[PDB]
C-alpha cells in the first residue's frame, strides 16, 4: 500500500509515470517501473542496477526498440498494466516476508524480480543483469549499510 511507501519509493512511482509519458505510452508497465527505479538514482534499487552496468539511457533505448515509441503523449494519470500492479502488490509481499514495516525502492525491485516475466525482466536480461543477480545485489545492500544505518 502506498501509505507504507517511503518518500523515495513514492518518487519511483511518480517518475515511472513521467517515463511512460515521455515514451508516449498509455500504460505504466514494469519497464516504466524499472525506469523510475533508475531515474530515482539514490536508493538501494538504483545502486543495485548501476552495479550491474544498467543505465537509464540503455533501458530507454531497449524499451523503444522492444515496444516502440508511442504516437501521442498521454495526459493525466497513466494507468498501471496488470503486471505493474502485480509488481507493486509483490513489493508489499516482499517487505512482509522480510519482516519490514515499510516499502522502499528495494522492495519494488524485489517484487519486479519476483514476478520475473514482463518487459523489465526481458530488458534486464538482454542488458546483462540476470534477475537472480539483481536480487542478490539488493539483499547485499540491505544486509550491509542499510542494517548498519538501522543499528546506529
Amino acid at each position: 500500500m502506498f501509505e507504507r511507501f517511503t518518500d523515495r519509493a513514492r518518487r519511483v512511482v511518480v517518475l515511472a509515470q513521467e517515463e511512460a509519458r515521455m515514451l508516449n505510452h498509455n500504460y505504466i508497465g514494469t519497464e516504466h517501473i524499472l525506469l523510475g527505479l533508475i531515474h530515482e538514482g539514490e536508493g538501494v534499487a538504483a545502486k543495485s542496477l548501476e552495479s550491474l552496468g544498467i543505465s537509464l539511457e540503455g533501458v530507454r533505448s531497449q524499451v523503444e526498440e522492444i515496444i516502440g515509441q508511442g504516437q501521442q503523449a498521454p495526459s493525466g494519470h497513466i494507468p498501471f498494466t496488470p503486471r505493474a500492479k502485480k509488481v507493486l502488490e509483490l513489493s508489499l509481499r516482499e517487505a512482509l516476508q522480510l519482516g519490514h514495516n515499510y516499502i522502499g525502492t528495494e522492495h519494488i525491485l524485489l517484487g519486479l524480480i519476483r514476478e520475473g516475466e514482463g518487459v523489465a525482466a526481458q530488458v534486464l536480461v538482454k542488458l546483462g543483469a540476470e534477475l537472480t543477480r539483481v536480487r542478490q545485489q539488493v539483499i547485499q545492500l540491505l544486509s550491509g549499510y542499510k542494517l548498519a544505518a538501522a543499528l546506529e
Binding site: 512511482v13 494519470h77 507493486l88
Partner: peptide, 7 residues
C-alpha cells in the same frame, strides 16, 4: 492504490 499514480 492500485490504479494509477499514487492511487
Amino acid at each position: 492504490x492500485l490504479y494509477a499514480x499514487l492511487x
